[PDB]
Design an enzyme around this catalytic site. Sequence first.
Site, mmCIF file in Angstrom:
data_model
loop_
_atom_site.group_PDB
_atom_site.id
_atom_site.type_symbol
_atom_site.label_atom_id
_atom_site.label_comp_id
_atom_site.label_asym_id
_atom_site.label_seq_id
_atom_site.Cartn_x
_atom_site.Cartn_y
_atom_site.Cartn_z
ATOM 1 N N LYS A 1 3.414 47.926 21.959
ATOM 2 C CA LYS A 1 2.241 48.522 21.432
ATOM 3 C C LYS A 1 2.454 49.337 20.196
ATOM 4 O O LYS A 1 1.613 49.323 19.306
ATOM 5 C CB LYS A 1 1.361 49.194 22.457
ATOM 6 C CG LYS A 1 -0.015 49.329 21.859
ATOM 7 C CD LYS A 1 -1.104 49.736 22.822
ATOM 8 C CE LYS A 1 -2.304 50.142 22.005
ATOM 9 N NZ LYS A 1 -3.483 50.473 22.803
ATOM 10 N N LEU A 12 3.901 48.726 17.891
ATOM 11 C CA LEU A 12 3.891 47.799 16.824
ATOM 12 C C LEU A 12 2.593 47.561 16.099
ATOM 13 O O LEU A 12 1.493 47.822 16.549
ATOM 14 C CB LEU A 12 4.533 46.501 17.284
ATOM 15 C CG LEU A 12 5.984 46.390 16.847
ATOM 16 C CD1 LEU A 12 6.453 47.667 16.180
ATOM 17 C CD2 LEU A 12 6.823 46.104 18.082
ATOM 18 N N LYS A 54 -0.833 41.731 27.821
ATOM 19 C CA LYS A 54 -0.173 40.457 28.074
ATOM 20 C C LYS A 54 1.383 40.607 28.242
ATOM 21 O O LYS A 54 1.983 40.078 29.151
ATOM 22 C CB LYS A 54 -0.763 39.281 27.265
ATOM 23 C CG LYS A 54 -2.174 38.981 27.812
ATOM 24 C CD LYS A 54 -3.005 37.863 27.163
ATOM 25 C CE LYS A 54 -4.122 38.337 26.221
ATOM 26 N NZ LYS A 54 -5.382 38.722 26.875
ATOM 27 N N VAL A 63 -2.118 11.903 17.687
ATOM 28 C CA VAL A 63 -2.524 10.712 17.019
ATOM 29 C C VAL A 63 -2.728 10.965 15.572
ATOM 30 O O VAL A 63 -3.674 11.572 15.203
ATOM 31 C CB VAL A 63 -3.787 10.122 17.550
ATOM 32 C CG1 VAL A 63 -4.138 8.988 16.585
ATOM 33 C CG2 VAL A 63 -3.606 9.638 18.987
ATOM 34 N N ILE A 116 -5.754 12.385 13.851
ATOM 35 C CA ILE A 116 -6.268 13.248 14.866
ATOM 36 C C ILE A 116 -5.833 14.652 14.660
ATOM 37 O O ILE A 116 -4.691 15.051 14.625
ATOM 38 C CB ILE A 116 -6.041 12.734 16.299
ATOM 39 C CG1 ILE A 116 -6.922 11.509 16.563
ATOM 40 C CG2 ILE A 116 -6.459 13.793 17.285
ATOM 41 C CD1 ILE A 116 -6.662 10.819 17.898
ATOM 42 N N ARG A 160 12.103 8.489 16.039
ATOM 43 C CA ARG A 160 12.963 8.976 14.974
ATOM 44 C C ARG A 160 13.484 7.856 14.078
ATOM 45 O O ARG A 160 13.357 6.675 14.404
ATOM 46 C CB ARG A 160 14.110 9.753 15.578
ATOM 47 C CG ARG A 160 13.619 11.036 16.207
ATOM 48 C CD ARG A 160 13.066 12.004 15.168
ATOM 49 N NE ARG A 160 14.020 12.334 14.106
ATOM 50 C CZ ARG A 160 13.833 13.277 13.165
ATOM 51 N NH1 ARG A 160 12.732 14.028 13.111
ATOM 52 N NH2 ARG A 160 14.783 13.484 12.250
ATOM 53 N N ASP A 166 10.485 10.606 8.980
ATOM 54 C CA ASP A 166 9.805 9.756 8.032
ATOM 55 C C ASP A 166 10.539 9.652 6.716
ATOM 56 O O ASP A 166 11.522 10.349 6.510
ATOM 57 C CB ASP A 166 8.411 10.281 7.762
ATOM 58 C CG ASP A 166 8.317 11.609 7.043
ATOM 59 O OD1 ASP A 166 9.245 12.311 6.637
ATOM 60 O OD2 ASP A 166 7.052 11.915 6.908
ATOM 61 N N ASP A 177 10.619 10.219 2.687
ATOM 62 C CA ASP A 177 9.989 10.845 1.550
ATOM 63 C C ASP A 177 10.444 10.391 0.203
ATOM 64 O O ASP A 177 11.472 10.829 -0.262
ATOM 65 C CB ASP A 177 10.224 12.343 1.586
ATOM 66 C CG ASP A 177 9.167 12.983 2.420
ATOM 67 O OD1 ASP A 177 7.978 12.775 2.203
ATOM 68 O OD2 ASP A 177 9.642 13.715 3.423
ATOM 69 N N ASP A 180 6.133 7.996 2.445
ATOM 70 C CA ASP A 180 5.315 8.677 1.465
ATOM 71 C C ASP A 180 5.964 8.639 0.070
ATOM 72 O O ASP A 180 7.074 9.145 -0.125
ATOM 73 C CB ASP A 180 5.051 10.177 1.805
ATOM 74 C CG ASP A 180 4.105 10.627 2.914
ATOM 75 O OD1 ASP A 180 3.411 9.870 3.594
ATOM 76 O OD2 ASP A 180 4.142 11.962 3.057
HETATM 77 MN MN LIG Z 1 6.800 14.173 4.904
HETATM 78 MN MN LIG Z 2 -2.351 14.107 14.792
HETATM 79 MN MN LIG Z 3 -0.353 49.695 16.614
#
Ligand SMILES: [Mn+2]
Ligand SMILES: [Mn+2]
Ligand SMILES: [Mn+2]
Length: 327
Positions: free
Chosen positions: A52, A54, A64, A95, A98, A141, A182, A184, A248
Amino acid sequence: ETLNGGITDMLTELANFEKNVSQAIHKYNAYRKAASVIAKYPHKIKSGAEAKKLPGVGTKIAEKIDEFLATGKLRKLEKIRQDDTSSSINFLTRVSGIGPSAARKFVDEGIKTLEDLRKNEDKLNHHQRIGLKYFGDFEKRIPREEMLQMQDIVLNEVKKVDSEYIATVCGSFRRGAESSGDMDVLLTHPSFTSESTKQPKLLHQVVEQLQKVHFITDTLSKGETKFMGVCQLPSKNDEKEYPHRRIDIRLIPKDQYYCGVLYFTGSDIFNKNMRAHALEKGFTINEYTIRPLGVTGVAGEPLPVDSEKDIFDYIQWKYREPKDRSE
DNA sequence: CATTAGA
DNA sequence: TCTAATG
Ligand SMILES: [Mn+2]
Ligand SMILES: [Mn+2]
Ligand SMILES: [Mn+2]
């Protein structure tokens, strides 16, 4: 880094949730800064109270923190973890195409699974359609082994079309990495820079090349300076075809390469760190250039670059092979 | 953080 | 035009 781990990760869970399943931009933003400051703190948090003190740490999060400290868990966390809808969102989300927006939308519509999505390919767009199609392969991968084979072919037509090209395959790849997610490809040409008002065809020419040969198989998106796609290595003398790869390619003004190159090549840390240095060294670095600093507070004026070296020379550092650009 | 789609 | 999604 570990002394305050559970709290950080918990929080981020907390955070990622509001943003996705809910629209709680703020709350989400909330968890983030906290998840950040708490991460910095040099001691073991022993209580909310403690936390706290903080910044950004409110009553809400501190409450929490206690529960988590006290008992190895959190219900809210447990509840979400269970929440089928919620779950649903996280899922749809892999996806490619998505996003949270669609996710929720789809969900509400009853589309919660892979199958669902199939059943209604109509309800999806090309990106999402492709995404759909290569769900498995996009999640897989990419062995450097392939990275090597891929790079090769690419550099091949690049060259074939026009010998004046310059392509660099940046990222972790470039960085040595046993595998990548991927490919690049950074792209440039003399005949293209800062002012020289484009030549979209510059881009165009290659994708078309790549395609003609079967390297490019789909278009996620093609713009005059950034193509985004799918590729595959010629499935050999049978029995073994290749998984669909996200690729890409991007156009760059020959006058900004190496920075960009430097940049995209990372690592995120390497960069940050190098960049931090350029500050002391009376400089400024960012994805496109390198400017000398003026004591007034700031300054401009783009120092000329021809190689990854110049940038280095500039800030009077040790040339770091990309291998060891890890940090 | 800028580019692309799309509606 | 804006809004979303990638990087
Ligand atoms: Mn990339
Ligand atoms: Mn996605
Ligand atoms: Mn504070």
